[PDB]
């Protein structure tokens, strides 16, 4: 298969033709010749005048009093985040193409919505070597890989300041789209909605939906427990979750997501939410008091999804750039450009989000401190301290490096070697190719990708060639940008699938982005004036401080 | 409810505020005022340029020696062909909004791909009368509406020539995104594809498509009887079909859609469309006989959904609309422009395509005329003459006028009926509510409803109030264009559904529509080249004329 060296560069559509030859479909990819490589005119111009990424983070990130007028000028502010969506969604194929089983495009890799879509296709079967023509004929150990390049020894704490806040907002967020279904296989999800559905807290199907709410004023089942409200049980309910068997029935919680039982820092957020849900229930019951519980209940959805994008925009991403220049989340930026309102995850913004490095070593609420054999499936510990000393624990609390390499806790060492086992399953292409993906030049060598000379050393010695090296070990050892959480290929891969998955939602489309969506303009506001803050202030008992990085 | 009454203009939103007043959402309807039916200043001067659709129209179907000129001026005809589709389109929310269950925004009509969409919301529950203030408390007897208004006496001719080629084409084309779930109601549907994927050819599920399929060479199964390529039975695939006890077993050919064992015109382009893709096969596999049997039958698909787009655009709706321009394919068109790649099937859609006054009293066949006793169901007769006799004999037989009513044949009485009614139950609103939702000045009476004096005299009767006519029988009664087979309400609302149909299909996506996505530049010039008459002329022995209009 001559098309196994990737030649077509620039987006080239590689196609074969007989057994000795290929054929790269330059089509509207701004570039000619065999290989899609010789630009024409008005590429030469753009690459010429365009600043790498990192000089534009240097630029994002200093001059915060240049920033500080551009932040209370609207017409500007508005002008560059809507130049931030465009030109990141634009990297993004919308609607979708490959998945793991097509290297073509085809109607069963469109429309079959149990697959995760590619952003890159999968390595053809009869390739030379596992990842096209480069390598050794096998890959490396997976499990040496992770001892010797992302196992933690010593703690690394997040030098941007994120918390355990920040932390568990990641696992519970991106796990409403980021449900891989295991009985089929890691090319498969559970997640159809493929985006903010919310159906983290109201159930994947209409069955378990009607399980957990109360169809009583539009709300959620809950249970009162010390005064507070929290989510009902897999008894009350009948909704099915995973739990181990020592976990008593009455602490069995039951929320829309199977797995959020894990840890207390998921149920937490899953209280939280649906405390938030059941609060703009009443709000709403006085606007609309003629309203039935089946339109409370809808209405409702809508704006915890509106408030979820506007939390994840402006406190979420704003945390993880680094930025003095404030994002916004308004679906009108939008409405004079092209834009596909609609997504389909992607199996590799499943991979890259594998920020596991975030997890600290203990978990320390109040004045204890629990490992993860005492942490995991402990409902009780919610309960014991409460939702409100949680946030407050957790708001102090330091989370892990991600980039870096070297800062995954023993404890999720295995899932860690799962990522890249599933990774091959999957055929991937290699890093190398991904950055090429996502207009990042290729690095060149081991030791330009990890900055330093010990871990690009044992890189070396593992898989020998650059281009050989692998899309999720390389993620994580890739040198940090200056005082980063990330380096430079998590965040250009990851702000495009981020930025398309947050505004290709059907609310941010003009027929549904007005008041009337949301019961008028309380229920609007409520969206448009959301926050992390607010989102505890409303919900937790005290209004405690809170943001996603440490004081 | 105060909104029964529909007191928003102008697309604005109406919503119940409290239990005896009512609030109307304006946003970007180009009005204000409570009703948002005060024109604002831009709006003023688009209303007082915009000329009528029958001017328009009248326009399109005139001055031929001028229309041929615009036609060989590529950059004019793609101009006018391109302001054609995104105008029209507009007229369409996409991502959808409401359905049969919800008049109002919520994530169950949106994300719920069983639901028929719908460009009006349903008349509330619990209002005066059934389509919301207007008209008696009950509306008029749907057999009186029937028998008084839309049955047959006397066979009506098209004006335009329409023949049983096209005919049977609007019905096979068309099955392919209706397919009402009649085991829930008429507001369910089995298309889940929405749209133009050729599941009544593939099969709708992976399960029914791998009966159908051969696995060798990308193709599908068939028989050869009499020399030529027939589909294959139920017995060799095990692919269900809705035949009779009657029906032997050698005669139960089965294809993608269920129910096409119907009528032998069906299985005519059931025959021909399956012979096409076998063809596309062989084609491809010189193209590349280092392809595997999976991408053959992938690509072959691909590049059917393009000839079926194709001809619907080029061939049958220009022949539809009888304008002497010259219509055209070309999803480059749309590159420029504000378009949304995706689509939902409306149920208003489904209805008003109820074309059976298309259908004539019997059916000739060669030198044999059959009764709806002894057609349906009887592929005894598509063995008996043969595919070329079939195509020889609907190409000249005339359809029947869809317009002006009184041109139902009997047989379909039932099922003319069921349209009412289904309607009815899905709490459509007025006939003139939807003239207003596709910017049309509603009928003041119904001589101007029907241009005549018998029919409406009948109507009146029936409603009494113009305001209260269904959307079904408004549209087979309603005065036609001059000597055109529709009135104009079937074309304003009729051509937003089909253009958006057509090109919100992923493959005229950028991103899709290059060569390699079907095999490289002969098999994309398959598609651009299509026609109804090269489809005919491909697949069917002899080569014999054909066109949806009688010699
Ligand atoms: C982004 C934040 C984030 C955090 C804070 C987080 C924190 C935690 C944590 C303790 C707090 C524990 C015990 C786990 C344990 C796991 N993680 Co996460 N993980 C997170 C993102 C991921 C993602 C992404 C996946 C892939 C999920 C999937 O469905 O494939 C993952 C999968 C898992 C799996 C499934 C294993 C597999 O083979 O797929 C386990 C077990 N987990 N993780
Ligand atoms: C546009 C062309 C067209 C033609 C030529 C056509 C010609 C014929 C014909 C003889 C030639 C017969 C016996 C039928 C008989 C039927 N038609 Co059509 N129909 C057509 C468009 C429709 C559409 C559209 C529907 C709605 C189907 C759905 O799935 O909801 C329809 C539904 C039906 C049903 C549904 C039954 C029910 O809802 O109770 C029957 C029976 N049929 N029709
Ligand atoms: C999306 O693609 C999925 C994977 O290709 C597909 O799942 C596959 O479905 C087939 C047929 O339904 C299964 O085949 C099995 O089915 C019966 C079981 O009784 C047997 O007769 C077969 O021989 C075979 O055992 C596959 O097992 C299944 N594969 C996986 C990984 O789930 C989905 O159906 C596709 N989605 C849609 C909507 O079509
Ligand atoms: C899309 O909307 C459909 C209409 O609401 C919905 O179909 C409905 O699905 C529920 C299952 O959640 C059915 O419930 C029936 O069966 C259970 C079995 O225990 C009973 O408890 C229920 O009382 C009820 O009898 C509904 O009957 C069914 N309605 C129809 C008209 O088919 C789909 O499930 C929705 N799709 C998705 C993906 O949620
Ligand atoms: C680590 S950094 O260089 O400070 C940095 C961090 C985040 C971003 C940004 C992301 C992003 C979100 C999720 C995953 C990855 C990136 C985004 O959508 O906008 C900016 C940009 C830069
Ligand atoms: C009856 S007519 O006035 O000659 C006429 C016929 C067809 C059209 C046209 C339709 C159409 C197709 C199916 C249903 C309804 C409209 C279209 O999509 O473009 C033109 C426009 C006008
Ligand atoms: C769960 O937490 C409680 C404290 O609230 C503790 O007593 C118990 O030991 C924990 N469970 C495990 C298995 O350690
Ligand atoms: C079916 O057609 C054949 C001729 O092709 C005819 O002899 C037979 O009677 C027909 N069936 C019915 C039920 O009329
Ligand atoms: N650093
Ligand atoms: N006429």
Request: include cysteine; aromatic fraction near 12%.
């Amino acid at each position: 298969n001559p098309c196994c060296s990737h030649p077509c560069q620039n987006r080239g559509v590689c196609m074969s033709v007989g057994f000795d030859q290929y054929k790269c479909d330059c089509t509207r990819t701004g570039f000619y010749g065999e290989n899609c490589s010789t630009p024409e005119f008005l590429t030469r111009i753009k690459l010429f005048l365009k600043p790498t990424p990192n000089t534009v983070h240097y630029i994002l990130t200093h001059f915060k009093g240049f920033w500080n007028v551009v932040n209370n000028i609207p017409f500007l502010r508005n002008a560059i985040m809507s130049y931030v969506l465009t030109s990141r969604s634009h990297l993004i194929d919308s609607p979708p193409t490959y998945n793991a089983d097509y290297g073509y495009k085809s109607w069963e890799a469109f429309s079959n919505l149990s697959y995760y879509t590619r952003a890159l296709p999968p390595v053809p079967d009869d390739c030379p070597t596992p990842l096209g023509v480069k390598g050794k004929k096998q890959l490396p150990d997976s499990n040496e890989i992770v001892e010797k390049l992302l196992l933690r020894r010593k703690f690394i704490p997040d030098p941007q300041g994120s918390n355990m806040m920040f932390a568990f907002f990641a696992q519970h967020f991106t796990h409403q789209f980021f449900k891989t279904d295991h009985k089929r296989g890691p090319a498969f999800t559970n997640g159809l909605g493929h985006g903010v559905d919310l159906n983290h807290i109201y159930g994947e199907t209409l069955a378990r939906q009607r399980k957990l709410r109360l169809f009583k004023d539009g709300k959620m089942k809950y249970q009162i427990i010390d005064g507070e409200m929290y989510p009902p049980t897999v008894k009350d309910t009948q909704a099915e979750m995973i739990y181990p068997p020592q976990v008593p029935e009455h602490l069995r919680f039951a929320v829309g997501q199977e797995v959020f039982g894990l840890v207390p820092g998921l149920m937490m957020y899953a209280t939280i939410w649906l405390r938030e849900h059941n609060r703009v229930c009443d709000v709403l019951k006085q606007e609309h008091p003629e309203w039935g519980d089946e339109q409370l209940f809808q209405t409702s959805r809508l704006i915890l999804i509106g408030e979820t994008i506007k939390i994840v925009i402006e406190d979420y991403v704003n945390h993880l750039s680094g930025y003095h220049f404030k994002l916004k989340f308004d679906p009108e930026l939008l409405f004079n450009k092209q834009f596909q309102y609609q997504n389909r995850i992607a199996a590799e913004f499943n991979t890259l989000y594998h920020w596991h490095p975030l997890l600290p070593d203990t978990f320390q609420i109040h004045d204890q401190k629990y490992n993860y054999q005492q942490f995991i499936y402990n409902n009780s510990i919610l309960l014991e301290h409460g939702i409100t000393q949680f946030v407050e624990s957790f708001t102090r609390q330091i989370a892990g490096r991600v980039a870096g390499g070297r800062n995954v806790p023993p404890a999720v060492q295995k899932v860690s070697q799962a990522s890249i086992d599933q990774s091959r399953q999957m055929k991937y292409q290699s890093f190398n190719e991904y950055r090429k993906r996502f207009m990042l030049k290729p690095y060149e060598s081991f030791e330009e990708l990890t900055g330093e000379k010990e871990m690009s050393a044992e890189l070396e010695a593992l898989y020998g060639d650059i281009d050989a090296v692998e899309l999720y070990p390389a993620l994580l050892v890739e040198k940090p940008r200056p005082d980063a959480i990330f380096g430079e290929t998590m965040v250009e891969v990851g702000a495009p699938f981020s930025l398309k998955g947050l505004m290709g939602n059907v609310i941010c489309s003009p027929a549904y982005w007005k008041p009337s969506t949301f019961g008028g303009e309380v229920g609007f506001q409520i969206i448009n004036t959301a926050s992390i803050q607010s989102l505890i202030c409303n919900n937790v008992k005290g209004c405690p401080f809170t943001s996603f990085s440490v004081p």
